[PDB]
Ligand binder design. Structure first.
Ligand SMILES: N[C@H]1CC[C@@H](Nc2cc[nH]c(=O)c2-c2nc3ccccc3[nH]2)CC1
Length: 293
């Protein structure tokens, strides 16, 4: 009786079996799906490694697959490490688990531990990861303090790439078609007006991320809370056009409390109305380093 001979099974370390991936809790609820803390426990004794698992809620599978392929080929100390995948056409993205979470979770609870010097070092690391992303012709489109993971007191990593798009060679921007649900209070005017995304658009979002970092991610002084005070919080569908109008008028987020003018000036260089007039990530690194020593 016939039976197929089995060759030597080259066991894949980036392949995680669904049966061993055991859910612990929810970490976040992103744009398209969910992120959960799991323990890959093949020995079934609660000793397995803790991993961050990104999946979809039951179309948008194409976006997750493209996000997986982007992260798989990113290698930088300030970019969350890709660990692998869990296959079914359904797919799950496995990433390293950073128990400190994002700056949004970490900063309000560790104010006494993080001084201005440490805040400027995080800013340098965010810029380096962002510059590495830009050099590989990519636009992040979701740079906020909530997407900056804390590895330790001395190291941060860009931890989510759900909205990352590639900029075509011999082209300066990407045109978004699905601009819902956009983080409008973090976006540059060209993103809000014409739905165009340049590298300079990410520099604008960095300025906003830097403002959050300096305010230790306090909810009351958040970019959304502050801009809604400037434009009005009861405009509904007229919020974005009022936001564009306010930015055109020259109005920008105020100086964070206890932030020196020289840091605020670097932040202002990120907020030039025209993308071509904005500072680069490399000029920001230079700027922060100069203030460090
Ligand atoms: N705010 C979004 C950041 C991106 C995603 N989160 C990741 C991703 C990859 N690796 C991680 O370790 C985490 C992580 N989030 C945590 C939330 C609380 C505590 C620990 C956490 N770890 C979703 C939430």
């Amino acid at each position: 009786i016939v039976s197929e001979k089995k060759p030597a099974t080259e066991v894949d370390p980036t392949h995680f079996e669904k049966r061993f991936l055991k859910r612990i809790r929810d970490l976040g609820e992103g744009h398209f799906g969910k992120v959960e803390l799991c323990r890959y426990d093949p020995e079934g004794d609660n000793t397995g490694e803790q991993v961050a698992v990104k999946s979809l809620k039951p179309n948008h599978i194409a976006d997750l697959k493209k996000e997986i392929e982007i992260l798989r080929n990113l290698y930088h100390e300030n970019i969350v490490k890709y660990k692998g995948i869990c296959t079914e056409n359904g797919i799950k993205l496995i990433m390293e688990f950073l128990p400190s979470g994002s700056l949004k979770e970490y900063l309000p609870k560790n104010k006494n531990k993080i001084n201005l010097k440490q805040q400027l070092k995080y800013a340098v690391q965010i810029c380096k990861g962002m510059d590495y992303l830009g050099s590989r012709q990519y636009v992040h489109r979701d740079l906020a303090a909530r997407n900056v993971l804390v590895e330790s007191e001395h190291q941060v990593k860009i931890g989510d790439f759900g909205l990352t798009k590639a900029i075509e060679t011999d082209k300066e921007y990407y045109t978004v078609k699905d601009d819902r649900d956009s983080p409008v209070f973090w976006y540059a005017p060209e993103c809000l007006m014409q739905s165009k995304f340049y590298i300079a658009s990410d520099v604008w979002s960095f300025g906003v991320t830097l403002h959050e970092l300096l305010t230790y991610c306090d909810s009351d002084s958040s970019p959304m809370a502050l801009f809604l005070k400037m434009i009005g919080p009861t405009h509904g569908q007229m919020t974005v056009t009022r936001l564009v109008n306010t930015l055109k008028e020259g109005k920008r987020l105020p100086c964070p409390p206890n932030c020196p003018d020289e840091v605020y000036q670097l932040m202002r260089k990120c907020w030039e109305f025209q993308p071509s007039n904005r500072t680069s990530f490399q000029n920001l690194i230079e700027g922060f380093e100069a203030l460090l020593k």
